[PDB]
Ligand binder design. Sequence first.
Ligand SMILES: CCCCCCCCCCCCO[C@@H]1O[C@H](CO)[C@@H](O[C@H]2O[C@H](CO)[C@@H](O)[C@H](O)[C@H]2O)[C@H](O)[C@H]1O
Ligand SMILES: CCCCCCCCCCCCO[C@@H]1O[C@H](CO)[C@@H](O[C@H]2O[C@H](CO)[C@@H](O)[C@H](O)[C@H]2O)[C@H](O)[C@H]1O
Ligand SMILES: CCCCCCCCCCCCO[C@@H]1O[C@H](CO)[C@@H](O[C@H]2O[C@H](CO)[C@@H](O)[C@H](O)[C@H]2O)[C@H](O)[C@H]1O
Ligand SMILES: CCCCCCCCCCCCO[C@@H]1O[C@H](CO)[C@@H](O[C@H]2O[C@H](CO)[C@@H](O)[C@H](O)[C@H]2O)[C@H](O)[C@H]1O
Ligand SMILES: CCCCCCCCCC
Ligand SMILES: CCCCCCCC
Ligand SMILES: CCCCCCCC
Ligand SMILES: CCCCCC
Lengths: 48, 1044
Amino acid sequence: DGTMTQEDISDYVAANMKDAISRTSGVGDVQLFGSQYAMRIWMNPNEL
Amino acid sequence: MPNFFIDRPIFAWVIAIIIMLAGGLAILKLPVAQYPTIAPPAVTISASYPGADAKTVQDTVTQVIEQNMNGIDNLMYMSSNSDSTGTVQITLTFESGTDADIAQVQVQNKLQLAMPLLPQEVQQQGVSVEKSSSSFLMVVGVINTDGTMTQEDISDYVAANMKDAISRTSGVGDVQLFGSQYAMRIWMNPNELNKFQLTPVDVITAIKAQNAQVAAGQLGGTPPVKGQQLNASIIAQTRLTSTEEFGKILLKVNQDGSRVLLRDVAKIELGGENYDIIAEFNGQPASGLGIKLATGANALDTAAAIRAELAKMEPFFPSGLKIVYPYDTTPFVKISIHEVVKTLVEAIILVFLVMYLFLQNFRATLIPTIAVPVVLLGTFAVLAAFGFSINTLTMFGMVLAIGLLVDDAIVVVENVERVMAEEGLPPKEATRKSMGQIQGALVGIAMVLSAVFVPMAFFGGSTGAIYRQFSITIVSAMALSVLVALILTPALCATMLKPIAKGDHGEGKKGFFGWFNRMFEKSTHHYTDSVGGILRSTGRYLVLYLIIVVGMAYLFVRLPSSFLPDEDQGVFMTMVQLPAGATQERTQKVLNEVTHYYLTKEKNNVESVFAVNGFGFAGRGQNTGIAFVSLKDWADRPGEENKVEAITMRATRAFSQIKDAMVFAFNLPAIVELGTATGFDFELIDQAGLGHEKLTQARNQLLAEAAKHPDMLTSVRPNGLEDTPQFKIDIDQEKAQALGVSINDINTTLGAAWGGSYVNDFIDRGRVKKVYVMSEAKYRMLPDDIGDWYVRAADGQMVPFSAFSSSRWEYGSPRLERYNGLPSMEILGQAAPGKSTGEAMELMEQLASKLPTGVGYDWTGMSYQERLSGNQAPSLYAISLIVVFLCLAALYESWSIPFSVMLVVPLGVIGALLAATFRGLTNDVYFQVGLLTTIGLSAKNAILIVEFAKDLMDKEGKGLIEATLDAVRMRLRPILMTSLAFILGVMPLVISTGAGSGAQNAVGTGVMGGMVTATVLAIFFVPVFFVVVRRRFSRKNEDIEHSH
Ligand SMILES: CCCCCCCCCCCCO[C@@H]1O[C@H](CO)[C@@H](O[C@H]2O[C@H](CO)[C@@H](O)[C@H](O)[C@H]2O)[C@H](O)[C@H]1O
Ligand SMILES: CCCCCCCCCCCCO[C@@H]1O[C@H](CO)[C@@H](O[C@H]2O[C@H](CO)[C@@H](O)[C@H](O)[C@H]2O)[C@H](O)[C@H]1O
Ligand SMILES: CCCCCCCCCCCCO[C@@H]1O[C@H](CO)[C@@H](O[C@H]2O[C@H](CO)[C@@H](O)[C@H](O)[C@H]2O)[C@H](O)[C@H]1O
Ligand SMILES: CCCCCCCCCCCCO[C@@H]1O[C@H](CO)[C@@H](O[C@H]2O[C@H](CO)[C@@H](O)[C@H](O)[C@H]2O)[C@H](O)[C@H]1O
Ligand SMILES: CCCCCCCCCC
Ligand SMILES: CCCCCCCC
Ligand SMILES: CCCCCCCC
Ligand SMILES: CCCCCC
């Protein structure tokens, strides 16, 4: 529906689905194809 | 085999004797327990963040560990509490049958990935991973009878001299100290600190520097110079050992050379690492150890090892110190098992008496009597072979087995008798011909009987492990009984039986027997006379049979069903929960009331009370407590009113009138793991980052709605705590920067003063213990005290907290719950009277669907399994019926004749249902197994009756009615001998009072009623079943009378 970018989706999956799946019966390891969000501080060396 | 051993009695004896030795040896080594283990293993991770609030614990420790919990085998669910005591507990619950050692290894492998991400202060408190039951196995209390040690003294003694060895003992899963080990306490005074321009930061630095243990090398150490003569260790600073030494720690020297010592800015004393837990025993100062059993360990063995270790400590106690025993779950196990043993012995005695009444000869009665203990002992050997324990269920299996065993011996011994009476053949020759004619049937019967007891070995889940104990015990015993009947009994008949002369029936005797024997011979002709009559009638009796069936059906659907009875185990607990925000002093006042009640209003029932302030199943908190209560022996507590159920009910009622507290006494269930036979355990879940406040609102909405369906739901309530006022302090970054005060100094001053800080270790009387710095109590009681704490700025100026902070009141949680890694709130409740757990749960689900967006739910604990699903009964007894039919068809080489045996089934059930309905009993485990036994026996009786009739009609040429009557008359006596021996044998059970009498009563009364109706109803009905079935399913060829 055009409301979430790829990175949004990856955060949603990381933060709401992956942990439970990885604790599900018979599941051995789970690889995220993407990345959970972090707070990103993108520094500017000139302003620094 | 029979012929072989008839000529070799000594060989027969040798086999019996070796079987008994094997059994006796098993009994000496076999584990003893109340029940087989059915609890899901649970691994618990525990951590502590001194001075942290619940949210700080959750967001800094609990979430971090939880996110690392993955790829763990057999995990059913995970739950956690993070509380404002600074404590986290994370519980991982595993599938039944999971190896707890591996579960623990797998949990810790994941925990170690989280460990480095935890605050240093949390890592230094020690995180632990344990595998233990949730309940206490026992509490070992410690008091001082000379009153020469305070509560704090005793607690330190226990912590320092007793706790570690107990914690190392195999089978001990977890040990809780009810009190605290001493630490060196440095109680800081902000006024003095500010006066000397010092802060808690300087205090901590000085303690680390001056309470140090330094490695300093050696004189003449390797590699040395050539010619070296001296080698000695260099000893520099060592840990401080006393308050005197800590007091002279040098904080600084003034400009004028005067000294500032630690004792100048602090009070210094030995005192607890914490001050949250305070216990009393019968109102006096005490400490103690609350011990939990490691997963799967044997309760009795572990308790014995604990006592053995305690006994090693006693001789070195300081004067007056004494161990007391306020709460132990294990004595009841030992005692209840021993009462079942007594009934076994008693049962064998009664069997001996009934045998005599009929056999009238010491040596003869001895045969069926020897057979029982031989088979029973062998059965223990088989249990060992299969890795079973001696438990309540295997023991009742033995008791129930006696009916089957004694009947085997009786059938064998009686049949020989009848033979020596019907022919005057001598003993050796008679047992031969006898064994020749029944031996085939004994073996076949054991087969059809296994068809009634095996199916129950296949019940599913937790239920199943219980029924399996019986199944295997009873089947094994029956198999051994056939063996013994084929080896020992024939040998014994042939050597120990008295020659009976053709025609003799004991009427020649004078005295009671002569009289008895005459009455029976007579009453027998009267029996046959009656059947002969009934067989000319009938039609009417099929109609009576249908009455009994419908009646049976009526009683069945009306008899409520349960699982295992609650027993009075001579102990119980009382929970005390005040609102969060409540003080330790208020909790003590409520505990005093609880103690007072047991000490004064339950004098005749209660032996002791061990009450603990600051610990509950929470655990820790100022607003919680628990009392462990031990009752006097069952024998001094005669009557319903003096048993645990009525005591706990009266207590709860008295305690309901305690202001602003929830206090209730309750009896533990047979199996917690199973829970409250009616309860549900519900988890409300934040599925969408909603947050605590919104989850609370959803919870409240759900509670309100549930409060409107009293017709279905009762006592639907939260398991956790309500939000409480908290003091929010905002540090002003800009002001701090302006004044040159570091945020680290601010936070350490605030935290150390108001929360306390574990600095490093010291040595107290040879034992490593902790050093804590914290504000003296009077400077951390009031909000205004905050501004009395000063921090030193870079430019050396002392700056009060009030200069760089502001504060406000708000509300927050003292305890945050998570379930499967999501924020949660647990809700307890139960089905309203008349309503089924399923119904209540369905409704909880409906209401849950009406909740705000983002709120979900789950079922846990007792409600988890459970769906799962129920009622396997119909299916399994269905196949049981079918297999029984098939077995009988093989035995009789007929598809129709088996019905003449199977129609007896209802006749024992009816009496069982009647007697149980009458005594107010339930359709529970004990009712069911006893019924199978009763059914087994009446089946066996019917099988031997129609076997005899059929043979008569087949070998001889006897016609239908004649054969039925001769069959029924030959079988009356053996049937009566067995019925009476067994009904009397279970008398001790229905009559039982005392330890485990709930179980005993439940077993006994079902059997007694069943056997009574089975016996009286079968001896008339079976002949009916037979002729009615022989007609209906024949083929024009009689029913004379023919031959040959
Ligand atoms: C006709 C014979 C009847 C008894 C035959 C005995 C055969 C072998 C018994 C050994 C096993 C245990 O036997 C029995 O155990 C229990 C448990 O402590 C004791 O029975 C109990 O007596 C009172 C009341 O009944 C209890 O409150 C107490 O806890 C316990 O001592 C009995 O005193 C003991 O006889
Ligand atoms: C009619 C015959 C058939 C019925 C008999 C059934 C008896 C049932 C017994 C169940 C309870 C017995 O429990 C068990 O008893 C023995 C008796 O000392 C104990 O065994 C212990 O005592 C003896 C010494 O006296 C030692 O050989 C042994 O090393 C020690 O462990 C077990 O540790 C205990 O677990
Ligand atoms: C492979 C998996 C399943 C295993 C099969 C299940 C077995 C079920 C059998 C149960 C009943 C067996 O019972 C057995 O029946 C036969 C046949 O009547 C009997 O045999 C005896 O009685 C019959 C009839 O009176 C005689 O014809 C026969 O000569 C005699 O030996 C046995 O004395 C008895 O022990
Ligand atoms: C021909 C030879 C053999 C004939 C069979 C004769 C046996 C007759 C009695 C069997 C027991 C019947 O009783 C039945 O037991 C089951 C559980 O075991 C009960 O089941 C109920 O309680 C249990 C509690 O643990 C639940 O798990 C279950 O989901 C629920 O429906 C039934 O409420 C009851 O009706
Ligand atoms: C342990 C009991 C020993 C029994 C001896 C049997 C005596 C019978 C000899 C024929
Ligand atoms: C289990 C039903 C068996 C039916 C047998 C009928 C024989 C004529
Ligand atoms: C289980 C089916 C048995 C059916 C036997 C029928 C005999 C005619
Ligand atoms: C369930 C009845 C309890 C009494 C046992 C001592």
